Amino acid sequence: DKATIPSESPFAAAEVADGAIVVDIAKMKYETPELHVKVGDTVTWINREAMPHNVHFVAGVLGEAALKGPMMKKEQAYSLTFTEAGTYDYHCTPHPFMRGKVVVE
């Protein structure tokens, strides 16, 4: 797999790590749709709105299986540590018009 998951469950926005690379989700959009990060970095998405959202990577992108992350309620967060360079597209499972990518370099 090309990503590690620190927490399987969503956690509170207050519990996000100090040096965290945060992508906010608000107004039915990932606020930074193209994020450039380097190998070994942890990206944390935080849902800032009441409608639940997640990140979903289809099969073969971060691993053999799809990684359909947990639904994040308002002010919940979810992290992924990227371990291999490449371009990783993702969408929100209930709202597939929400699309973004992480470019790990």
Technique of determination: X-ray
φ, ψ (nearest 5 deg) of residue 15: -100, 10
To the question of whether residue 98 is assigned a binding role by annotation, the answer is yes
Token pair of 45, please?
A: 């998405």
11 forms beta bridges with: 77
8 Å CB contact between 70 and 78: yes
Token pair of 95, please?
A: 């709202």
Q: For residue 86, which of 36, 45, 43 has the smallest C-alpha distance? A: 36
This structure's resolution (Å) is: 1.8
To the question of whether residue 36 is assigned a binding role by annotation, the answer is no
- Number of other residues whose CB lies within 10 A of the CB of residue 5: 15
Domain spanning 1-105: CATH 3.40.228.10 = no
Q: Report the distance separating Cα 53 and Cα 36, nearest Å.
A: 21
Q: Report the distance separating Cα 64 and Cα 73, nearest Å.
A: 27
Q: Is beta strand 56-57 parallel, antiparallel or unpaired with respect to 67-68?
A: antiparallel
Q: For residue 3, which of 67, 90, 70, 98 has the smallest C-alpha distance? A: 67
To the question of whether residue 95 is assigned a binding role by annotation, the answer is yes
Q: Report the distance separating Cα 94 and Cα 84, nearest Å.
A: 28
